[PDB]
Design a protein around this ligand. Structure first.
Ligand code: MG
Ligand code: MG
Lengths: 394, 396
C-alpha cells in the first residue's frame, strides 16, 4: 500500500516523567516512550525537531531511518545522550508502526523469538530520592530504613518475583564526610554491608539480589566494598565507580570475585563496543528507551553474546517502554532479566491496555502474538496522569 | 558582601546557527555566556533553565564546583555527553564571567594567567555552505567551476589579514558519491577532492597555512587512500577522515600517513579526551569550549595534550561572546596554536558585542584586554535585532 510518515507528536506522562512519542502513517500510528531524562521539555523539542527527516518516509525501514536521524545529529550531539534518548522513543514508535502496518509482532521484525515469556526483577526503595538518585528522605544513618527495605523485598517475592535490586548509597547522608570525593568512611562502610546482610537473611538464598552503588565512589572504596560483597553471592554489584572511565570499572571487576554490572549510562553501540573490549563487566544493562531503541539494543546484546556476557536491560518506564524491551529480550539468546521499578507505583498498569489483562504476571511478562508491540495506550488514563512545558498532542 | 546567584535567563540568537545565550545574575551584577549551536536551541534552552534550581544562592565564584554540581547532578539524565554538556558549557562561561566582574579581573587571570595577550585565528572558507549536518548546499564540491569561488574566498581571507585557511572536501550528497550510507570515495570523486586541494594551494602559496575538513564521513579504505594523497600539499592537518564514534579507527588512519591528523570537535569532557590521547590518535586537538564543557574543561583538555606535546586548537562556531571566551583559554595555555573563526560570510558578526578598542578581530588576531570578566559587552540592540523566531523566549 506504500505507507508514508504523516505526523509526529509528543506528550509527557508522569511515571518514575517520561515522554511519549506518536508517529503517524496516515490513519496508522506507532507508540514510543523516552527514558525520563533531563527536562521533558528538552526531549520534546529534540523529538519534534526530528520530524522533517521523518515526514514522507516509509516506516518499514526503521534501521535506515535510525541511521538517518542519528547521522543528522553528528554535529549536534548525536554521540551524546539526550539527542539519543530522544531518538530511542521515535525508533520505538517506528518499530510499533512497522509491526502493525505489516501485521506482525515487533519481535518477528527482530529475528523471531527465542522465548515468549520474559522474567523480571524488582527494585526496592527506601525513602524518597531526587533526580541525582540521592535520598532526601531516608539513608544509611537512619532508623527503620533497613526494615523498610526488607519489607519491600518481602512484598516483591510475594508478588511473584525471585530477583530483587536495591541501592546502598547515601552521599548526602550524615555518615558521609565529603560530597566531592568518592571516599567511604569506616563507619559508612559497615553500615552498607549491614543493609545488605539484613536483606540477604530476610529473603534467604535462592533469591537473586543485585545491589546498586549509583557510581559515586573512588577506586579504593569500590574495591574495599566489593571484596566485602563476596561472601554474599550477589547477582551483581552495579556501577561501583563513575560512568565516565571504563578502565576504572575494569580495574574493579578485575579485583574481586563479585560480578560487576553496568550499561545504564553508556549510549551507542560503539560505546558498548569499547566497554566489552576492556572486559569491563560480567553483565550488561543498557536502557532501550534511553540508548537508541530496540534495534540499537539488539546489536549491543549481540556484541555481548560473542563473549558469553548476559543481557539484562535497564528499564524504568511505563508499560510501553517496558514492553518495547520485552520484545528485544525475546529475540536475544543471551537475555537474563528485565528491570521493573514499579512495585511502588499502583497506577502503573492503568497507562495501557494489554491483551491478557495485566502486563506483568507471576513475575514475568507474557508477550503475545498480536501485531507490533501489541499495546494500546489508554488516553484518558494517560491524560489523568499527564505531567503538567510539553503539550498533550493538542 | 557574599554574592549569591539570583537569576538565570536565556535567549536564542542567529549566529552561524541558532545559539542560546546565557545570562546569570548575582544581584545587580551578571555574567554572559554563549552555547554552541546544538540541535534545537529550544532544547539547549530548556536544559539550561531546568538547571536553575541548582544554582540559586550559590557563590558564583567557585565556578568549577558548580560545573561538577550540575554535571554530577545529571548522572542519570544524559550528562555523560552531548546536549546537556553543551548547555552547561554556556552556563559555565557566564559564571566564569560573572566571577571575573565580581573579583574584578579579566577571565584569563582566573584561569592561571596569560602566556600570550593576543591570539591568532584561522578562517573557515566554507562558512556559508552550511547544512545543519555540515552538508554542502546548492551544488557542493563539484560543479561548473567551484574551484574559482573557493580561491576567491581563500584570497579574500588572506587579504582580510589571515594566514590560516580551512577548507571542506566532502560531498556525500553530490553526484560523484555512489552511496549515502557507506563512506566509500569513488575513483573520480577522489580526483575531484584532490583537485579542490591543489587549486587552493597553488593559489595562496606555501607560507599560508591550510587545513582540510572531511566532516568524518568515510571508511578505512577511503580515508587512507585520500590521506596518502594529502601528503604532498603540506596541509596544516587533515580533519576527521572517519566517523566520530570509533577512535581506534581515527588512530589507524593516523598511523597510515604523514599527513597530520586533527580531531576533537565531536568528543566531550576530559574523560573522553583522555581516551583520545590514550590511543595516540591526533597530531592536533580541537574541542569546542561552548560545546565540550566550558573554559575550565577546555583548559584541562589542553593540559592533557600538553603532556604529550600536542597542539591545542579549539573548534569555534560562535559569535563574539563564545569566541572571545575561547581566546581567554587560548591565552592561559602554552600549547595554543590557532582558534577558528567561521564568520567570514556574515557582516554583522561584530555588531553583537561592544569590544574595548574597535572591533574584536583585527588582522587575523584577537587582542585581549585587562578588563574584568572577558572584557566585552552585549549590544542588546543588535542582539535583539537578530533574535531567533523558533521557540525560546528572549530574556523576557
Ligand atoms: Mg541503576
Ligand atoms: Mg569541523
Amino acid at each position: 500500500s506504500a505507507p508514508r510518515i504523516t505526523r509526529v507528536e509528543t506528550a509527557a506522562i508522569r511515571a518514575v516523567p517520561s515522554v511519549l512519542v506518536r508517529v503517524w502513517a496516515g490513519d496508522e500510528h506507532g507508540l514510543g516512550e523516552c527514558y525520563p531524562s533531563a527536562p521533558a521539555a528538552g526531549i520534546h523539542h529534540i523529538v519534534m525537531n526530528m520530524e522533517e527527516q521523518l515526514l514522507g518516509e516509509d516506516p518499514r525501514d526503521v534501521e535506515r531511518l535510525y541511521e538517518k536521524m542519528r547521522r543528522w545529529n553528528i554535529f549536534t550531539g548525536g554521540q551524546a545522550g539526550a539527542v539519543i534518548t530522544a531518538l530511542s522513543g521515535i525508533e520505538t514508535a517506528l518499530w510499533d508502526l512497522a509491526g502493525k502496518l505489516q501485521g506482525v509482532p515487533v519481535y518477528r521484525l527482530l529475528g523471531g523469538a527465542f522465548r515468549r515469556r520474559v522474567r523480571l526483577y524488582a527494585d526496592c526503595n527506601a525513602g524518597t530520592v531526587d533526580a541525582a538518585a540521592h535520598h532526601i528522605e531516608g539513608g544509611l544513618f537512619e532508623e527503620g530504613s533497613n526494615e523498610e527495605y526488607i519489607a519491600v523485598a518481602r512484598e516483591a517475592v510475594e508478588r511473584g518475583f525471585d530477583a530483587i535490586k536495591l541501592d546502598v548509597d547515601d552521599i548526602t547522608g550524615p555518615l558521609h564526610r565529603d560530597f566531592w570525593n568518592g571516599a567511604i568512611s569506616p563507619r559508612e562502610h559497615e553500615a552498607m554491608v549491614a543493609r545488605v546482610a539484613a536483606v540477604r537473611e530476610a529473603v534467604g538464598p535462592e533469591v537473586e539480589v543485585a545491589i546498586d552503588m549509583h557510581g559515586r565512589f573512588d577506586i579504593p572504596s569500590s574495591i574495599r566494598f566489593a571484596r566485602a560483597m563476596e561472601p554474599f553471592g550477589l547477582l551483581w554489584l552495579e556501577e561501583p565507580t563513575p560512568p565516565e572511565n571504563l578502565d576504572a570499572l575494569a580495574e574493579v571487576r578485575r579485583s574481586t570475585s563479585t560480578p560487576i554490572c553496568a550499561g545504564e549510562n553508556v549510549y551507542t553501540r560503539f560505546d558498548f563496543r569499547e566497554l566489552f573490549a576492556k572486559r569491563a563487566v560480567d553483565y550488561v544493562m543498557p536502557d532501550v528507551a534511553k540508548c537508541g531503541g530496540l534495534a540499537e539494543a539488539k546489536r549491543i546484546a549481540n556484541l555481548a553474546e560473542l563473549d558469553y556476557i548476559p543481557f539484562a536491560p535497564h528499564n524504568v518506564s511505563s508499560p510501553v517502554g517496558t514492553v518495547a524491551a520485552a520484545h528485544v529480550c525475546a529475540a536475544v539468546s543471551n537475555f537474563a532479566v528485565l528491570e521493573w521499578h514499579a512495585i511502588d507505583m499502583p497506577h502503573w498498569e492503568d497507562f495501557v491496555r494489554y491483551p491478557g489483562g495485566p502486563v506483568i504476571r507471576e513475575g514475568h511478562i507474557e508477550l503475545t502474538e498480536e501485531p507490533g508491540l501489541g499495546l494500546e495506550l489508554d488516553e484518558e488514563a494517560a491524560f489523568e496522569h499527564r505531567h503538567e512545558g510539553v503539550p498533550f498532542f493538542g
